[PDB]
């Protein structure tokens, strides 16, 4: 359906052609979305509202590593492969984003996928899969084994470039953000440093924040929206965040850490305050600084960290793309009823468009 710009939300900067992480060439994204059952939750039987999102930095047939660096806003969550990134500045294989109860199954399934897809001599490189989570506990049977190995293989094999589906898909299927429906969002910026252009792409799996704090384009919007509070069986019940950054800039690992640390500023623009139990994390990678398996790293150009013109263009790109990806998520996610007949509303489009038109005539 509509994305945030289509409802009149303004943003700064110049988006890429897709306005998605796949504006960084060669990046592929895949989702498997598991939606089954209704009514009361029984552990092991559903209902299920869960899934997995796969990002292949260099595409699904690559055996090469990408340069990478991370940041932690609040570390109450899981993201595997990160000790590796901190130490050697690269990771091998895809990124998986999923629900908390699925981490182990996804991790082993990625290994199994490797056995089937990678030459035996290269299997040593496939030992530390990258798997991250947020908690779909209200809408999903977290502990009930709803995600299968076949679901994971389907996302790995089905991933592609081009437009990325947003909203209640893949790892975002069962999520809740700012008390509205959570999910997947994505955005990009094409940034200028003199005559050089680079792309910064961002994808988020959003399960964080309170309605009372939410800002969209600087507007504190929770109180301006009427209704759309969550429910349980019919009774109004009220009233973590994963960030993946891709760039084609040829950055070294410590420079990618800097990129990842900018995500918090974009999160801050939209009002949340990093809950004590909210696992909020960012991972950044370069698709031009690539490390062939067992060979010399390929760094086709080099950027000085004190070159403010280039670095600030890249940093502003991360902030803006993060800010927009978060709003794109909210708009893409539709109302859902899941486990225990819990109902969470998508942010209402008609009301958002009306508020945006009043604020930005």
């Amino acid at each position: 359906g509509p994305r945030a710009r289509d409802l009149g939300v303004p943003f700064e900067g110049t988006p890429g052609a897709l306005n998605a992480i796949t504006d960084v060439a060669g990046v592929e994204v895949g989702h498997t979305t598991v939606i089954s059952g209704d009514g009361a939750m029984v552990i092991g039987k559903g209902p299920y509202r869960t899934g997995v999102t796969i990002i292949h930095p260099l595409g699904k047939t690559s055996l090469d590593g990408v340069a990478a660096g991370r940041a932690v806003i609040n570390g109450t969550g899981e993201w595997t492969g990160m000790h590796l990134v901190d130490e050697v500045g690269q990771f091998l294989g895809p990124i998986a984003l999923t629900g908390t109860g699925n981490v182990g199954l996804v991790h082993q399934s990625m290994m199994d996928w490797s056995v089937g897809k990678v030459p035996e001599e290269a299997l040593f490189s496939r030992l530390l899969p990258v798997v991250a989570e947020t908690l779909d506990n209200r809408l999903n049977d977290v502990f009930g084994h709803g995600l299968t190995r076949d679901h994971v293989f389907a996302a790995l094999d089905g991933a592609k470039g081009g437009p990325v589906a947003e909203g209640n898909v893949g790892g975002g299927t069962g999520m809740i953000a700012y008390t509205f429906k959570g999910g997947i969002g994505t955005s990009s910026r094409v940034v200028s440093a003199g005559d050089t252009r680079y792309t910064v792409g961002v994808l988020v799996q959003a399960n964080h924040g309170d309605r009372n704090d939410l800002r969209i384009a600087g507007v504190q919007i929770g109180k301006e929206i009427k209704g759309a509070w969550p429910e349980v069986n019919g009774i109004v019940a009220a009233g973590s965040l994963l960030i993946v950054i891709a760039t084609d800039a040829p950055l070294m690992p410590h420079q990618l850490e800097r990129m990842a640390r900018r995500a918090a500023l974009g999160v801050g623009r939209n009002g949340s305050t990093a809950g004590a139990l909210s696992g909020e994390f960012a991972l950044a990678f370069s698709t031009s600084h690539v490390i062939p398996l067992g060979g010399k790293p390929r760094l086709p150009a080099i950027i000085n960290d004190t070159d403010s013109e280039t670095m600030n263009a890249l940093f502003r790109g991360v902030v803006q793309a993060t800010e927009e990806a978060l709003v794109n998520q909210l708009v893409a996610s539709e109302t859902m009823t899941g486990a225990n007949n819990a109902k969470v509303y998508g942010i209402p489009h008609d009301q958002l468009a009306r508020i945006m038109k009043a604020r930005f005539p």
Copy 2:
């Protein structure tokens, strides 16, 4: 004079009585402001637009440490005593905030002050002074020895509780923020968890950001303000024509060091609200301390109550307090800082009060 709220800027949460870092009882703040000379800069001769700000966590006569934790947004800058804070979760003595060229002088002056104020038996504890900087390079002769030991002593000895002066004072004297006049700002929040209340106080020394990114209460305001662009000479320096950040957080919550690191990491979200994107060469840092978790010199730490990190009600109240107080301290700074002409006749404008008030009235009727 008016602060941000008085010009009609809305903020979330409940401020303390002074709406300042000194709402955390026992904290003292002092400034020495050095403004002398006009015209062309000659290194070693001025003009000078610099100073130093002192924060005594437990007051100027305390020999005790405070529990502490820090966070780095972008580390292109200096803040001494921080390896100590990372290792042992406490620091001794005051925090000094100053201009980049003054760091060594301030560091040695704090040691000299200790020799005169601390019993010789306790001097061992005074070896790692806490000194942080931002760069006053457009308005000040950075390398020219404008700050003296006497200026540092005056701020150390003159510090007090009560209202805190903001704007072009102390370490903020020569600073520039969002292309407007930079300086010192402060704010506080009184936060609740069940029947318990705590105060979170914030003081900033702001020298960061670009006009085009600035948000005040969510409003992207730089293009709505007419004029007030800097001048380099007699002609317009930025925008159309030619015709670092230090954050100190105090709380009376009885937090352990790793919990204060969490508090410090919330400052970035408050900075983010106001639109900047952490420049490559901008040293943006946060330090948080507790005034109830105190470590008597050579004795047993005093931790009068203890908080679970997974107690979201308590922790989120504290975190939200940091975010909101940081957001407001930054806007308070801009409002307090007046237009200044300094070295090389560079002129930087205070954000115009009349225009800001008008924009806020139109936006928040």
Copy 3:
């Protein structure tokens, strides 16, 4: 059987009664050891030389957290739950130490175990299991699903206090250290901090280092031992005569330390590792995790900190730090002595450090 001290190896300090991590009261350890098959490796069909080691910091029935802090020597490996430890300074549930290929299975199995053992209202707290690995790739079919959920449950349920089995057991089953057989080792120290004596216990899963660098009690011993280099089908595979016929450190203490203080403890492990000569290989995932059994966090309640220690109290802190260094040093040697010769996948044969030669060298050096 003999441990390192019984072969004449001298160490500094005073061990606890068991000279093991279980000298810290209430800690329980369990192993499941999986050894099946011989000969050529086919992925999914073994041979298997693998397993899992479980450490319950407060015992298997506890729902409470322990204060914790970690350190990284070289981060090329996996240890889950560590973001949590860095952020909030505690973890819930047990520590699992296993082979690299088993991480996901163990992580999901720990969740399944919680579903069976923990009240539904407490399940929220069981979402970030702590699982760490070293790579058994020479002796084991890593990718071949040799470890099952039932193996994990058996270690979780079978864990106990008292003496801890060392050597080729649990997560250490298929490991190789200093080009000799690797595995599990443990040691403890009781350390005098003024009028109070604390216990520091250490358990290692050792899969690191080279024979040429190994020091035992300061003696560079690799060249003093004759033979015992690894083989394949009777042909020496490493060392001068070739061709011819990661490290996980777990520290427990009963000292009532805050999380940042436990990070300091964990950072001392590297010095104990250093004593024994290794240099942290580029691909060697070398990690330490320290926890307190007296600073405990009841689930959804107020942390219990029964006493408090000043970081600048060098008498207390240095006693604790020296304990970590000495217990780590000895745990590493205890591992080598406990681990016996093994032939595993692809007919790789790795020798236990020879007891007779070690004892002879120690007697000559330390009469």
Copy 4:
């Protein structure tokens, strides 16, 4: 005079020609040594036993940065410029190593030196000087302004390549290590990374450790040496007969490493320190800084990275890491051997480790 090898101490690996940090081409080192007064200490009036050591990574006329990374063993100390290193992976200007009381004076003096040596257009780059300390509190009047701006300028301007003076010089003048006289030590290794041989150079300012823990070439040597415990006016002040009659590590390499790779190098220092027995005291500020002299960043220009190394290339990386461990181990022993007995403030007398006894013990152990 004899260095450690000349007294019979064995070490592993191959030193560079000078066995010093200046085996990395282009590095310059200078010292200013301040020794005045005897007897009772009065703050502001000595006695003084202090100084400053300067390391210019690319020589004293360079305006360029070097790639760099750091590590902390125990952070109770000061080292400026390190937030910069962590953030952007480089630093500008020289490294100064000094006593704790001198940090501020040295920091401002380095800025003043820049005003006099650097074009005004480049001054922006000189605002984050790198200054580190250890505490000379037993032998020196720390707070008494013994070090002057002129002393700092003399070390900055006098620095040179070639042999590096060790012992009671520069920043090490008033230091104490392993209950013997502390000071400056240096060593290097040339390491074979396939077909390329890189140099790793290490300089230490040692003020850490206890005699009871000291190991030299693995030998626990404190109880083997007779006498030489510190004194005050002829009465022994420490050890069993008492009453009767921080660490800075600087690593240079010519390997073209990226900043995160240099952090890995710096983290290896701890293993070299561990070999020699210390346990990182609670108040001991123990720090390492590593830089590359081939990966250089011209001021306001494009970084120069003449070749690039894969972190997972264990052959190359392990050669470099082993170089750091071995050079750090040897630098520490070289310091002890270079430092002579000194009596300083408050009549504190600290002995250089005795050469005759050390040589005798080494001969017995390594015949």
